[PDB]
Amino acid sequence: KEPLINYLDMEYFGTISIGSPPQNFTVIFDTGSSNLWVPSVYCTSPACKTHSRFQPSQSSTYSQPGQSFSIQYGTGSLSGIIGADQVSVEGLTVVGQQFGESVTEPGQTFVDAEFDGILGLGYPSLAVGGVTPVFDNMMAQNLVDLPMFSVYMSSNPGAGSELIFGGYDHSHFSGSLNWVPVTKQAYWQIALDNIQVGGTVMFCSEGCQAIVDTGTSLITGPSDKIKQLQNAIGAAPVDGEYAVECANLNVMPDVTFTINGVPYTLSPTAYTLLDQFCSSGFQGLDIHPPAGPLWILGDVFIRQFYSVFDRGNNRVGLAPAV
């Protein structure tokens, strides 16, 4: 199986440290999950050999709570034991933070993944084993001035891309922030009024649920609706992805997501990946009930709209990125 297949595509990465002395790891900040885990030095899979692996014995501040763990991202389980130690995230250091030390097969493709682990930023209800998420510890340990964090994902050249704990940077967005209430506290789940193409409602006419997920590269939705969306914008099937003729970019329709009565429009320039060819920034992904079905506003959306995640008021702030 490929437990992390949904994270193997274009992502943004950051660095964190665990233990004393610090052991560095490249991780993905994922608002679509809530656990922090990194490869264990005890993972002897060929796929783990190319990554930084946590070595408990080299850290004087490490301790074992006693519980083991197992997480699921929808395509296979990842298991190991839970550890506790100091975790540092540029400027801040959380003491006693618990995280997973994965041991089981992570998947052959993980061998070339550009990241080592994942740092979930979702709600604790999504955390497996009732392990307190990093951001919840930050709040509980009064490390942040405001109970929120925000993400800026740069489309060019992603040099200036940054994650901010404790607030947001108004230099990354124009106008005032539009707030959206979190409908279900697990993922950063919100409600869509409707989705329209070419200025005409075409999906979720009666509203549907979605989540703002930094861990998801594209904008996803029920596979069937996406197909309808693919040919509506002019995308065509290929080897396994949907391509679009770069030329007809200016003749393609706008895709608008109406959230809390506000229109969030994506021009074909915004929902098309230049990764010499042009492909679709939309993809099918069926989340099983009771959690799904869901639409996922991934990086493709966040690049167009600076996002603010506020645990203090349980809401999401959106505004045009700069």
């Binding site: 943004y12 990465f13 995230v89 405001l146 993400v151 994902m153 891309s161 994650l163 404790g166």
Partner: peptide
């Protein structure tokens, strides 16, 4: 008020 920035690439 301080902002704790985490660069992403």
């Amino acid at each position: 008020g301080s902002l704790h920035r985490v660069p992403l690439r």
